[PDB]
Enzyme design. Structure first.
Site, PDB file in Angstrom:
ATOM      1  N   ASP A   1      48.114  30.681  31.981  1.00  0.00           N
ATOM      2  CA  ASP A   1      47.153  29.775  31.350  1.00  0.00           C
ATOM      3  C   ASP A   1      47.340  29.697  29.851  1.00  0.00           C
ATOM      4  OD1 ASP A   1      45.037  28.339  30.612  1.00  0.00           O
ATOM      5  OD2 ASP A   1      43.530  29.602  31.654  1.00  0.00           O
ATOM      6  N   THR A   2      48.050  28.646  29.411  1.00  0.00           N
ATOM      7  CA  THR A   2      48.301  28.469  27.973  1.00  0.00           C
ATOM      8  C   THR A   2      47.033  28.135  27.207  1.00  0.00           C
ATOM      9  OG1 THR A   2      48.882  26.129  28.326  1.00  0.00           O
ATOM     10  CG2 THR A   2      50.697  27.677  28.424  1.00  0.00           C
ATOM     11  N   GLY A   3      45.966  27.713  27.871  1.00  0.00           N
ATOM     12  CA  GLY A   3      44.691  27.422  27.234  1.00  0.00           C
ATOM     13  C   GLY A   3      43.806  28.630  27.061  1.00  0.00           C
TER      14      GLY A   3
END
Ligand SMILES: COc1ccc(S(=O)(=O)N(CC(C)C)C[C@@H](O)[C@H](Cc2ccccc2)NC(=O)c2ccc3c(c2)[C@@H](NC(=O)OC(C)(C)C)CCS3)cc1
Ligand SMILES: [Cl-]
Ligand SMILES: [Cl-]
Ligand code: NA
EC number: 3.4.23.16
Lengths: 99, 99
Positions: free
Chosen positions: B25-27
């Protein structure tokens, strides 16, 4: 480009003729933007995240540019803490995760 | 490896002697795992996302194996709906976003 993750992967987007900042978010299935005006009809959607659920307005077939890449697809509008580009539009711009 | 984003980017992780499925999850700034025991000291933290905030326990210097790659870093433990590998550990396995 190749984006490392030492800082948040923020890019500029253009929607409605306006530039905004947004987070490239592989953990978001859909794209969610803060309150703004979009054309056309919307449909209801409920989406869940870390703290529970929020109601959003679903607009389909919206023109949006992401880091200079043109997309046309669904945008959810609602009380998100940050503008989020999710997988529905990350796939249109040809993004992958690599390691 | 190259992971496309047509579906959720889920991988197997090993943490605290347990196998879990988790989202790349890059967020997510930090890594957040569902309730489990971890050794050592911890301190409370609040983290926020869509829907609001949850309370977690912050454990530092925890070793994870993510899709076969070992990392060390902080892990947050609490009532997350999904196990999340965030940027603090994605950097350590060399993950980048490419388009
Ligand atoms: C400081 O460390 C962190 C702080 C916040 C977060 S976060 O989880 O709140 N988040 C930060 C964003 C919002 C800035 C990471 C994000 O990737 C999160 C990561 C995430 C993913 C899923 C659930 C919670 C959090 N995803 C979503 O919030 C999200 C967005 C849109 C959609 C969904 C999730 C999807 N949610 C969903 O499936 O919810 C269920 C599982 C509850 C049904 C529905 C389709 S659209 C993580 C670490
Ligand atoms: Cl860390
Ligand atoms: Cl690097
Ligand atoms: Na520790």
């Amino acid at each position: 480009p190749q984006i490392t993750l030492w800082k948040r992967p923020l890019v500029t987007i253009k929607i409605g003729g306006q530039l905004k900042e947004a987070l490239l978010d592989t953990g978001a299935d859909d794209t969610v933007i803060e309150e703004m005006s979009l054309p056309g009809r919307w449909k209801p959607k409920m989406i869940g995240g870390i703290g529970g659920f929020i109601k959003v307005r679903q607009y389909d077939q919206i023109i949006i540019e992401i880091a200079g890449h043109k997309a046309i697809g669904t945008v959810l509008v609602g009380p998100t803490p940050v503008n989020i580009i999710g997988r529905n539009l990350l796939t249109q711009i040809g993004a992958t995760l690599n390691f």
